[PDB]
mmCIF file with all atom_site columns, N, CA and C in Angstrom:
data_model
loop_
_atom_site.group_PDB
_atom_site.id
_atom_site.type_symbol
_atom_site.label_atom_id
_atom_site.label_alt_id
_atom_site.label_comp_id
_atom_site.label_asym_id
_atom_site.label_entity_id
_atom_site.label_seq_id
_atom_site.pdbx_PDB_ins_code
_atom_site.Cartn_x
_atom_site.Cartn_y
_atom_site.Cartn_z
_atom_site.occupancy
_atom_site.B_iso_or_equiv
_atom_site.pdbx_formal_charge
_atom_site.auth_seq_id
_atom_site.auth_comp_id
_atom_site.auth_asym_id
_atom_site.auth_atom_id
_atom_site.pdbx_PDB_model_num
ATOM 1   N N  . UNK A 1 1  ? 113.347 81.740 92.754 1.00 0.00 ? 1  UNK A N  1
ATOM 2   C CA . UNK A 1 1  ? 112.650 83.083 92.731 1.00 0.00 ? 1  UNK A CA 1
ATOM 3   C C  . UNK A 1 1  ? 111.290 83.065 93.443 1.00 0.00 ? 1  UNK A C  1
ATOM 4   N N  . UNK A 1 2  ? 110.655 84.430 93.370 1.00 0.00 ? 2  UNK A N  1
ATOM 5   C CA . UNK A 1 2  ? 109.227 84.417 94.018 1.00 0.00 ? 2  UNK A CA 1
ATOM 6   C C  . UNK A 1 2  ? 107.678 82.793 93.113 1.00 0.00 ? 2  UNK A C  1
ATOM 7   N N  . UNK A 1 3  ? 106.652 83.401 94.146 1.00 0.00 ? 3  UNK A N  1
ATOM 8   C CA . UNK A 1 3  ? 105.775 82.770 93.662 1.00 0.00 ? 3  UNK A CA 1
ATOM 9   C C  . UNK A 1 3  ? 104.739 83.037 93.522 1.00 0.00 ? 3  UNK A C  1
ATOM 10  N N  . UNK A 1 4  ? 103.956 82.722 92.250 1.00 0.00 ? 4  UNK A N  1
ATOM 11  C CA . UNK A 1 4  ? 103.349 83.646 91.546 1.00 0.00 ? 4  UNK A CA 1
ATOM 12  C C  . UNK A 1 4  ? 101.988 82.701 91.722 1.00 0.00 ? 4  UNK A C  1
ATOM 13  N N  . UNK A 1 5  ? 100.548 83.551 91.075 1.00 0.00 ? 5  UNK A N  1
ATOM 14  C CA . UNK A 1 5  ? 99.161  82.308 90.625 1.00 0.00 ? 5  UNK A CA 1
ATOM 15  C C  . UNK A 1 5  ? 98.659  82.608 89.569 1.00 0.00 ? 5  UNK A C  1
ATOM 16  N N  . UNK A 1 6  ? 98.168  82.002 88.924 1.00 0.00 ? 6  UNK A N  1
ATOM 17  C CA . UNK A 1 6  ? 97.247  82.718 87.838 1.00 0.00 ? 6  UNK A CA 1
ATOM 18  C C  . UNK A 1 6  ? 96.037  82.853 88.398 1.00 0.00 ? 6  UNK A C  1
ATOM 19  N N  . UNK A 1 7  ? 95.564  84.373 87.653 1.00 0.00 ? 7  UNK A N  1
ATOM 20  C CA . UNK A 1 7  ? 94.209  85.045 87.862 1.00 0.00 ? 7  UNK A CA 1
ATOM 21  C C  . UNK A 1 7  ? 93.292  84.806 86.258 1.00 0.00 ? 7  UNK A C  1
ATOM 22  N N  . UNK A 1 8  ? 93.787  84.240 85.629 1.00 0.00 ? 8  UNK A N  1
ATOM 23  C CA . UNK A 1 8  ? 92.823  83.786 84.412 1.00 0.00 ? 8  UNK A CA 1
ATOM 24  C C  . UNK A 1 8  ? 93.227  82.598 83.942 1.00 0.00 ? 8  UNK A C  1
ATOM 25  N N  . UNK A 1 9  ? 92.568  81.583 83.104 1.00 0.00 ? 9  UNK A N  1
ATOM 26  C CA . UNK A 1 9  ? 92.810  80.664 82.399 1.00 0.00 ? 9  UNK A CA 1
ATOM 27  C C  . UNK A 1 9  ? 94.010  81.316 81.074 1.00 0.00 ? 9  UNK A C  1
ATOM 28  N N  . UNK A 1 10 ? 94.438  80.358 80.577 1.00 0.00 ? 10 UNK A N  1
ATOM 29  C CA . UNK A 1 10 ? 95.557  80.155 79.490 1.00 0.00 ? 10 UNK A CA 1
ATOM 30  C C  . UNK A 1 10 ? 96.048  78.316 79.000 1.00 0.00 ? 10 UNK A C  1
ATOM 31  N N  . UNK A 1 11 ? 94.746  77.842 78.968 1.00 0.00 ? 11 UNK A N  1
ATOM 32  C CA . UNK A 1 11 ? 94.251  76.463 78.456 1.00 0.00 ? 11 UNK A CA 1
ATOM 33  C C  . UNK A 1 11 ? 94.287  76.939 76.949 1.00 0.00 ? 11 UNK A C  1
ATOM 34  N N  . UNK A 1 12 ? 94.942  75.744 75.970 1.00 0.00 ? 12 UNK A N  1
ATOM 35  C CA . UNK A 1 12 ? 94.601  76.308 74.892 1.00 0.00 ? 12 UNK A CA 1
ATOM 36  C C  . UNK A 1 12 ? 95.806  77.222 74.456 1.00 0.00 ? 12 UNK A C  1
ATOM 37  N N  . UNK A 1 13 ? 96.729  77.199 75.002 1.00 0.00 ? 13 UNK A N  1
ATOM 38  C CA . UNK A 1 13 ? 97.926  77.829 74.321 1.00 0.00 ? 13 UNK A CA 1
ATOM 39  C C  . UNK A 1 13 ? 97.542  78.454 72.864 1.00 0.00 ? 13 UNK A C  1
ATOM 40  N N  . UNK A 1 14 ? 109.551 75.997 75.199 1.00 0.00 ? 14 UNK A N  1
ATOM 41  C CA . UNK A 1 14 ? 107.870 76.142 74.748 1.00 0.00 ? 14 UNK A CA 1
ATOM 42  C C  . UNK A 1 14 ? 106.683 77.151 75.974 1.00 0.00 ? 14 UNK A C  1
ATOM 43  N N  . UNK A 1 15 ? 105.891 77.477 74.901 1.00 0.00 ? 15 UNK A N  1
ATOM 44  C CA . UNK A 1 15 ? 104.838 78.285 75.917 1.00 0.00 ? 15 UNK A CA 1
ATOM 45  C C  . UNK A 1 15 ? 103.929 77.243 76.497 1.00 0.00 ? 15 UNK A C  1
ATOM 46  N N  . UNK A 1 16 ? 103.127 77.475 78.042 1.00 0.00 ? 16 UNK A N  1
ATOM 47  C CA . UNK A 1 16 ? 102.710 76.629 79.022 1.00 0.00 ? 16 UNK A CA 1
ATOM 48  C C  . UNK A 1 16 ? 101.251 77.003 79.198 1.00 0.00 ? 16 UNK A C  1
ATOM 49  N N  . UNK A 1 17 ? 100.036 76.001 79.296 1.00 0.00 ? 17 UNK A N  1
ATOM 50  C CA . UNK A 1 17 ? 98.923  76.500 79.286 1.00 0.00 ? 17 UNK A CA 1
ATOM 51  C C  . UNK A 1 17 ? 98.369  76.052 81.420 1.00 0.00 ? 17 UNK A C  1
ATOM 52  N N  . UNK A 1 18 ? 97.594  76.523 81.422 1.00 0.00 ? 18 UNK A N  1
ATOM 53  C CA . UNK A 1 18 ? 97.006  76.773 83.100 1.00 0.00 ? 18 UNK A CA 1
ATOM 54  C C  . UNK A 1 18 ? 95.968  77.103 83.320 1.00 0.00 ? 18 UNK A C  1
ATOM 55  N N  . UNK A 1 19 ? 95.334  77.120 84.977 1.00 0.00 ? 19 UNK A N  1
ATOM 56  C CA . UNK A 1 19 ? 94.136  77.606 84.920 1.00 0.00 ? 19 UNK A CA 1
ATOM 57  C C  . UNK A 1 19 ? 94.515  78.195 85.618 1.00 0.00 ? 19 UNK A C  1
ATOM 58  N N  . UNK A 1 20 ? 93.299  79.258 86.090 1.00 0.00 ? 20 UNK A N  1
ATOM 59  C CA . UNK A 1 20 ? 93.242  80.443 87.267 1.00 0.00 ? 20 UNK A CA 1
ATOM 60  C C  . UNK A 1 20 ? 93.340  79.766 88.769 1.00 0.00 ? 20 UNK A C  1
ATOM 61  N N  . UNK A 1 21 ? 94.211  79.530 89.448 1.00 0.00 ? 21 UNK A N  1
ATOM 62  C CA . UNK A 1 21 ? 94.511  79.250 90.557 1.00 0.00 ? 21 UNK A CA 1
ATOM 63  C C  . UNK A 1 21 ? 96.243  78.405 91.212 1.00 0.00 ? 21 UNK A C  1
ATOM 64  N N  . UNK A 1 22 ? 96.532  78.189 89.422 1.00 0.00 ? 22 UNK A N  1
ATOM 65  C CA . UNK A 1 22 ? 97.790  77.461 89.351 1.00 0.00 ? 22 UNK A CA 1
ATOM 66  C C  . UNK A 1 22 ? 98.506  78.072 89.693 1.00 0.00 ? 22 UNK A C  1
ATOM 67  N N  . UNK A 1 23 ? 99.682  77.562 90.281 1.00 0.00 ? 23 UNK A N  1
ATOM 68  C CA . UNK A 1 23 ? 100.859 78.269 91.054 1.00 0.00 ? 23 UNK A CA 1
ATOM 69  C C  . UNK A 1 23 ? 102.040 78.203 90.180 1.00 0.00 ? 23 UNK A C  1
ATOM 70  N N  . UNK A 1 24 ? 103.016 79.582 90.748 1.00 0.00 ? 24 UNK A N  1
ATOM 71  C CA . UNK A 1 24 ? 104.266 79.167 89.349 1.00 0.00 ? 24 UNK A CA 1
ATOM 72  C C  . UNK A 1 24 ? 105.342 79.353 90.364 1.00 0.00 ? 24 UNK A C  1
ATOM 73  N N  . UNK A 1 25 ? 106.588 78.851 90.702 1.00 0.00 ? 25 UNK A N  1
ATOM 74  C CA . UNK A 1 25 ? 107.742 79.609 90.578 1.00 0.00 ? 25 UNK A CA 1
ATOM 75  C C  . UNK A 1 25 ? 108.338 80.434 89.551 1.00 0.00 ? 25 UNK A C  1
ATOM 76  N N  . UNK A 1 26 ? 108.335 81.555 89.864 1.00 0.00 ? 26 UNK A N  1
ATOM 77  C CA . UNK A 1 26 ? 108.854 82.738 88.533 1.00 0.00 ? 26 UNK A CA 1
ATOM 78  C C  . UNK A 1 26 ? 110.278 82.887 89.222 1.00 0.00 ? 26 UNK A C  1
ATOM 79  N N  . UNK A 1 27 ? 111.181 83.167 88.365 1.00 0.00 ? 27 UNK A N  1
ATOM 80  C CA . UNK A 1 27 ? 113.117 83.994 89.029 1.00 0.00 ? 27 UNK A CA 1
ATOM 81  C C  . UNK A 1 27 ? 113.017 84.749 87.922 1.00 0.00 ? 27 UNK A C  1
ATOM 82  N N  . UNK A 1 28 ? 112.250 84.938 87.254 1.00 0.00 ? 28 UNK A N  1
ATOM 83  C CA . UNK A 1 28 ? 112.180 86.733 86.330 1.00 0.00 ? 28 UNK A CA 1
ATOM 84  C C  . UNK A 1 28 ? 111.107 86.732 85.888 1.00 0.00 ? 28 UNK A C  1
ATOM 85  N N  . UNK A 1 29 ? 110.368 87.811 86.807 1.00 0.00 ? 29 UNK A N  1
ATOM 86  C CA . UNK A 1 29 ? 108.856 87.862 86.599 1.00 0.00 ? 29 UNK A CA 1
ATOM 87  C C  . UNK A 1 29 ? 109.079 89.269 85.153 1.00 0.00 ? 29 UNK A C  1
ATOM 88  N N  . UNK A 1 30 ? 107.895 89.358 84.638 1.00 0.00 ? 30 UNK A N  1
ATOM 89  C CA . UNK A 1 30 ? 107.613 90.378 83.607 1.00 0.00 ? 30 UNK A CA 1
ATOM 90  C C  . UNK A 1 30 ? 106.403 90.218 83.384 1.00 0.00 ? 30 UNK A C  1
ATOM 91  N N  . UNK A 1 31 ? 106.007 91.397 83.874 1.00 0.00 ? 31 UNK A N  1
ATOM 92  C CA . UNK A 1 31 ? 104.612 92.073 83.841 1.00 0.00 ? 31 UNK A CA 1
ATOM 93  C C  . UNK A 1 31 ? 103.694 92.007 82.001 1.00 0.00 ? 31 UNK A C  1
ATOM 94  N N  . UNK A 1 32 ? 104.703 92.318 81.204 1.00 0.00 ? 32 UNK A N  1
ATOM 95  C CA . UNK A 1 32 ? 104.613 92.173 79.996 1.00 0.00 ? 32 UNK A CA 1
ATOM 96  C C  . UNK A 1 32 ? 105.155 91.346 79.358 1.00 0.00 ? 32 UNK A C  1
ATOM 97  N N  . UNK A 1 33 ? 104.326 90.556 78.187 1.00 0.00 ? 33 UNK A N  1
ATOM 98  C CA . UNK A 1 33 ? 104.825 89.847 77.731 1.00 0.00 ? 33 UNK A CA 1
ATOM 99  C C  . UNK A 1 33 ? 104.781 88.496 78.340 1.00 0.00 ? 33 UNK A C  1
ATOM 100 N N  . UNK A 1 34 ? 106.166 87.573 78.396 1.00 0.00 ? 34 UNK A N  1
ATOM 101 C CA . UNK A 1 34 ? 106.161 85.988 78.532 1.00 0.00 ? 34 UNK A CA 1
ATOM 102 C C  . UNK A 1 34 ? 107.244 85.807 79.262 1.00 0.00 ? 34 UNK A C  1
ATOM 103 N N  . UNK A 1 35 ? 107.242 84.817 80.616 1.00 0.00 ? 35 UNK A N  1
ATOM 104 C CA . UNK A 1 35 ? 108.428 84.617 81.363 1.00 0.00 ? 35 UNK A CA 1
ATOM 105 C C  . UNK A 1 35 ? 108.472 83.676 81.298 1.00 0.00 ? 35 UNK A C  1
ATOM 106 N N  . UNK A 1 36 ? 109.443 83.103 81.929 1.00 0.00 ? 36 UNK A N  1
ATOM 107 C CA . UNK A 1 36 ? 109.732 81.544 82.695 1.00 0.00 ? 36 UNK A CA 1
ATOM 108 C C  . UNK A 1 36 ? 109.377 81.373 84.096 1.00 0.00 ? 36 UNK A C  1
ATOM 109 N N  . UNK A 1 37 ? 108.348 80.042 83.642 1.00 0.00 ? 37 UNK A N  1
ATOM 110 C CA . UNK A 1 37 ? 107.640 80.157 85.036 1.00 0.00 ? 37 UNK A CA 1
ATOM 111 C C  . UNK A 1 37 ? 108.156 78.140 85.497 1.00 0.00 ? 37 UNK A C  1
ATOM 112 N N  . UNK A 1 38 ? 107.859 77.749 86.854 1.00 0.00 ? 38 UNK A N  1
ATOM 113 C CA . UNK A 1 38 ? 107.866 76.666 86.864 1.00 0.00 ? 38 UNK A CA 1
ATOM 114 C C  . UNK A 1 38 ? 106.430 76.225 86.844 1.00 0.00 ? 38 UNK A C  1
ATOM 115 N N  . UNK A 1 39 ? 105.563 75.662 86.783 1.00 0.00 ? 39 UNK A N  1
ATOM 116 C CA . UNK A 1 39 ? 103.921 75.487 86.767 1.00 0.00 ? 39 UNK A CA 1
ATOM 117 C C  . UNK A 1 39 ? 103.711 74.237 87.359 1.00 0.00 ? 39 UNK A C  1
ATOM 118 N N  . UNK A 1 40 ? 102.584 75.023 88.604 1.00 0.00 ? 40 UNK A N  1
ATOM 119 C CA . UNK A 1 40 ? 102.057 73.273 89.578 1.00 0.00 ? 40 UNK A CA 1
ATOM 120 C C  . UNK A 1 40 ? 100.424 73.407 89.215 1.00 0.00 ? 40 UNK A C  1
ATOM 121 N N  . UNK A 1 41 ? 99.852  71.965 89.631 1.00 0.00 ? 41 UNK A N  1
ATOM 122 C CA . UNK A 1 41 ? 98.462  71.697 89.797 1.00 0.00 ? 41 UNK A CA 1
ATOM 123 C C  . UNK A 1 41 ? 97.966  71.878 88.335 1.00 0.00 ? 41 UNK A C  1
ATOM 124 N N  . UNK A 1 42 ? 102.722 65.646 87.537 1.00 0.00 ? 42 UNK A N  1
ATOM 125 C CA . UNK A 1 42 ? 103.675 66.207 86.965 1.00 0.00 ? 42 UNK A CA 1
ATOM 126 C C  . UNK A 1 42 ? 104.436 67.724 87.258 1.00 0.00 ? 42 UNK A C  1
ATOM 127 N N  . UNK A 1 43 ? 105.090 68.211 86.465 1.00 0.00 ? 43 UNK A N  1
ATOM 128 C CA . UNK A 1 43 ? 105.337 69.806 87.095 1.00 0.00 ? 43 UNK A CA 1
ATOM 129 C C  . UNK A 1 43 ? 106.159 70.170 85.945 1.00 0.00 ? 43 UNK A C  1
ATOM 130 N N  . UNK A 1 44 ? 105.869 71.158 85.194 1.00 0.00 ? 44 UNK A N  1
ATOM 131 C CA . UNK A 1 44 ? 106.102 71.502 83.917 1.00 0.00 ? 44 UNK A CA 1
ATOM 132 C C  . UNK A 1 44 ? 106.814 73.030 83.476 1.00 0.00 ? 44 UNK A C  1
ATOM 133 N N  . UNK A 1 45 ? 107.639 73.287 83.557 1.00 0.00 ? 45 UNK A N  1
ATOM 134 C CA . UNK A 1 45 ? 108.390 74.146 82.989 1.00 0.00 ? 45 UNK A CA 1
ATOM 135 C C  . UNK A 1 45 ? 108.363 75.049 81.717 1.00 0.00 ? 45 UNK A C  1
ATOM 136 N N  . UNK A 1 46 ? 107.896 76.254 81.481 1.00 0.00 ? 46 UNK A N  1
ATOM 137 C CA . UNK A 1 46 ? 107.975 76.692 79.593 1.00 0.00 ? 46 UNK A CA 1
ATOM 138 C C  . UNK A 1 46 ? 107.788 78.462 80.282 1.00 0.00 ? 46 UNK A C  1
ATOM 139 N N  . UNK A 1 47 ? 107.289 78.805 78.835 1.00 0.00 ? 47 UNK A N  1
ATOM 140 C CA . UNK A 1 47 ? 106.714 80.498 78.899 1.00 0.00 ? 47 UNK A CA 1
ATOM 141 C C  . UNK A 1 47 ? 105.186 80.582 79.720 1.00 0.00 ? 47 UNK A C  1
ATOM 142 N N  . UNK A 1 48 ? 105.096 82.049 79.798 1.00 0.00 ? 48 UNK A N  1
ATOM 143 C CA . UNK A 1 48 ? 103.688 82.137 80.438 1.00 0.00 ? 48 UNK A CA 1
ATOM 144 C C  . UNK A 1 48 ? 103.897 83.782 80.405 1.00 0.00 ? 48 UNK A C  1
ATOM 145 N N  . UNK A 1 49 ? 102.457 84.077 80.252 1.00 0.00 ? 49 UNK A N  1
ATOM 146 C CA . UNK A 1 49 ? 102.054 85.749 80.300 1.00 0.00 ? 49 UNK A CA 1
ATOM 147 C C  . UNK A 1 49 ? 102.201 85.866 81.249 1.00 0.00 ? 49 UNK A C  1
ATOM 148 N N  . UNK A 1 50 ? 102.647 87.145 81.999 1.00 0.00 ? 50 UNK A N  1
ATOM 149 C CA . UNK A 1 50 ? 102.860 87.216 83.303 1.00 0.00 ? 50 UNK A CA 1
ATOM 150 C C  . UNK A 1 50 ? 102.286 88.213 83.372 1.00 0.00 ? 50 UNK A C  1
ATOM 151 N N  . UNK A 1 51 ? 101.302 88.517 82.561 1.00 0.00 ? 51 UNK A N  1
ATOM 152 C CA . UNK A 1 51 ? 99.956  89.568 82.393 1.00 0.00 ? 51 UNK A CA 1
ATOM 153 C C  . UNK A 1 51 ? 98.901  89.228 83.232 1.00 0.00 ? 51 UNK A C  1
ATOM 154 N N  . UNK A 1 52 ? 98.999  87.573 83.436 1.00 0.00 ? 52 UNK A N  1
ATOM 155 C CA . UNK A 1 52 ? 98.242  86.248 83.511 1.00 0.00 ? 52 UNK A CA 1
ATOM 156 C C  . UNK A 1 52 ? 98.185  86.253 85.397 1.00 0.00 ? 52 UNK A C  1
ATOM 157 N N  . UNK A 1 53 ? 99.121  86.916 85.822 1.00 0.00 ? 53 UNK A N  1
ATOM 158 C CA . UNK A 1 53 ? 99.895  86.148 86.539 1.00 0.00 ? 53 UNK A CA 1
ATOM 159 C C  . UNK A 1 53 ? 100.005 86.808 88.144 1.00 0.00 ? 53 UNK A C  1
ATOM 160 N N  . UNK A 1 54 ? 99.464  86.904 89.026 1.00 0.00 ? 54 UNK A N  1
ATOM 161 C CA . UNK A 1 54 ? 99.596  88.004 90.356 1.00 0.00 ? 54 UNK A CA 1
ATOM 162 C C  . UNK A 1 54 ? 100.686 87.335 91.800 1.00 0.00 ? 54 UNK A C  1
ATOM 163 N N  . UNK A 1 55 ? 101.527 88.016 92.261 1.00 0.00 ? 55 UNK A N  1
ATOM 164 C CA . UNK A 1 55 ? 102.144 87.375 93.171 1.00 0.00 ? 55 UNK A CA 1
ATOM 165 C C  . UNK A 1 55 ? 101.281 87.066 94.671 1.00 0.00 ? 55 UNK A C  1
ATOM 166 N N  . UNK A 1 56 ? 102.076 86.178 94.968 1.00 0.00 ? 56 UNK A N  1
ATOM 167 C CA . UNK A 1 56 ? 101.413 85.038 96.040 1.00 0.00 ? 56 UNK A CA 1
ATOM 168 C C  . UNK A 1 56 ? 102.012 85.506 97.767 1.00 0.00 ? 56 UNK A C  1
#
């Protein structure tokens, strides 16, 4: 699917914690709520706000 970044931290939280610049592969983004993201910058897989989250 597309690729996404975070525009805020979510350190501090399965659900996945990040900072503002981390990159995700998303294949079902949702604006609301919590998706499945892949998460870089290991490489870790879980939920994530995609509130969090602006495409790339």
């Amino acid at each position: 699917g597309r690729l996404f970044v975070a525009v805020f931290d979510y350190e501090t939280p399965g659900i996945i914690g990040f900072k503002a610049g981390d990159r995700f592969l998303i294949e079902e983004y949702a604006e609301n709520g919590w998706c499945e993201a892949i998460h870089m910058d290991p490489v870790q897989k879980g939920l994530v706000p995609g509130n969090f989250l602006r495409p790339l």
